[model samples]
Target: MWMPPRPEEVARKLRRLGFVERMAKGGHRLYTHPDGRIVVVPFHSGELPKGTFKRILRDAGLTEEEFHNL
Candidate 1:
């Protein structure tokens, strides 16, 4: 079984995978990579909604398992 991480945890995990925080827009954060991938993460205080989490993961081209491995 798998569980989702908190919003902040997601940000840290992305950083660990070489994703750089680019900028912020309202309550969301922009993460970018040198290879031209972009991910927008919500700057919430709790666990991200299921759809939002999945969408961000998809946008980053990362699977849940891949993120777990990192």
Candidate 2:
């Protein structure tokens, strides 16, 4: 099951991986790691689309298996 998790779950996962909330704007929030990894999370009520989720993973330098294993 490679479905995208909810925004909250995404936030939790990022935080667990040491990513911190940097800022929010236009219905989304950005997460950044000390090593320069950045993840953008949409602060929406519904689940994000797979494409959008993939982009987030891409920005965060994360792989689908990494997320699924989380």
Candidate 3:
């Protein structure tokens, strides 16, 4: 079964994946991977939709199951 990752877990995974952190508008943090892929993760605030979360996992080349495993 597929499971979703928590926000903090996702952030940690992004760092493990070597994504560079950049400052975004509205004080959001943007993580950019070496492949030029970008993921905008909110810091301790905001709501994210299911689609957006799924997209982040996809961008990281991880399946939903893989994301949950982390």
Cα lDDT listed for each candidate: 0.84, 0.84, 0.71
Error of 2 at 56 (Å): 0.6
Residues 14-60 of candidate 3 have per-residue lDDT tens digits of: 88768888775675678888888888876554545577788787777
Q: Which stretches of candidate 3 lie above 4 Å from their native place?
A: 1-4, 24-27, 44-48
What does the lDDT come to for candidate 2? 0.84
> Of the pair 2 and 3, which is ahead by lDDT?
2
**Candidate 1 lDDT over residue span 35-69, tens digit each:** 78899998855878788889889988898889777
For each candidate, what TM-score against the reference?
0.85, 0.85, 0.65
RMSD (Cα, Å) of candidate 3? 2.9
lDDT of 2 by residue, 1-70 (tens): 6565788887888888899998998989999999999888897667888888888889988887787666
Task: Provide the RMSD of all predictions against the true structure, rounded to 1 decimal.
Answer: 1.5, 1.6, 2.9
